[PDB]
Please model this.
Amino acid sequence: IAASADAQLELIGPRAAAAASLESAVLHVSLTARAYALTPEPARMDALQAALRRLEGAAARFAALPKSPEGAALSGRILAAVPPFEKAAVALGTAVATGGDDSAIRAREATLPPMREELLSLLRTFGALQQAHDAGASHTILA
Amino acid sequence: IAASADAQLELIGPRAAAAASLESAVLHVSLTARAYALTPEPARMDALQAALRRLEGAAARFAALPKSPEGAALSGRILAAVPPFEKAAVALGTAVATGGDDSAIRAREATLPPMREELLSLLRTFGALQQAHDAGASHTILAYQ
Ligand SMILES: [Cl-]
Ligand SMILES: [Cl-]
Ligand SMILES: [Cl-]
Ligand SMILES: [Cl-]
Ligand code: NA
Ligand SMILES: [Zn+2]
Ligand SMILES: [Zn+2]
Ligand SMILES: [Zn+2]
Ligand SMILES: [Zn+2]
Ligand SMILES: [Zn+2]
Model:
């Protein structure tokens, strides 16, 4: 009861942490993909690959958190956008790795930033709504 | 697209985490203090005690990370708010423990929530500003040259 309330409130820190880590994974993927387009070395290709695994890991962690009703709606949208984003970043990396046109690399890569922006904008809104519901639930328990 | 830019951007996650975690430690000290005062019992004194050590650790993690210039203002004040809030929390505890008068304990208790809400308000403002700053730095870092 008190224990179950406290269990609810203690999700805050981890929920916020998972959201930011998904945020940061989306960034790191964009950053590593851009850098590999820029300089098609082994270490760069490897860093991109590692970034995509980090992204799948962050999406999964994020997916597992209980969310507020508002929060869960956005969450679905966020998670549904992650596979297309990964997919596009994989095509980029592949286009580079296989020696594509400097023009084909440019085109694959140009696809990413609109997806990145959308993904980051949804997570930012998720953070805002969830934190508001956290504040309401917080007050109910401490009252 | 240099290494120095990854290092900058990789601070986002931990900083955000340390902010949420301090937010949570502060709630948790409030929640255990209240529960103790409502129902004085050994495990509840223990938890308030544990919550206090947790808050000192969360403050220390948060104080350790670099912050944007906007944050640095709010930041300084957040951290200075912690000791007074802990000190009040100890005084509520100690009052319940030493066998306080139902009135005096209500007074010490009442002195907590204002301090909690102010600190949490600051923290959330800090989060919003740092987020806006991180979003602008990320954008710039990934801009086409
Ligand atoms: Cl990054
Ligand atoms: Cl709600
Ligand atoms: Cl709590
Ligand atoms: Cl922006
Ligand atoms: Na509040
Ligand atoms: Zn990175
Ligand atoms: Zn709500
Ligand atoms: Zn708690
Ligand atoms: Zn700034
Ligand atoms: Zn942007």
Chain B touches chain A at residues 1, 5-6, 9-10, 12-13, 16-17, 19-21, 23-24, 27-28, 30-31, 34-35, 113, 124, 127, 131, 135, 138, 141-142 (CB under 8 Å). Helices of chain B lie at 3-9, 12-38, 42-64, 69-98, 102-110, 113-141. Residues A 6, 9-10; B 28, 31 surround zinc ion (ligand 8) (CB under 6 Å).
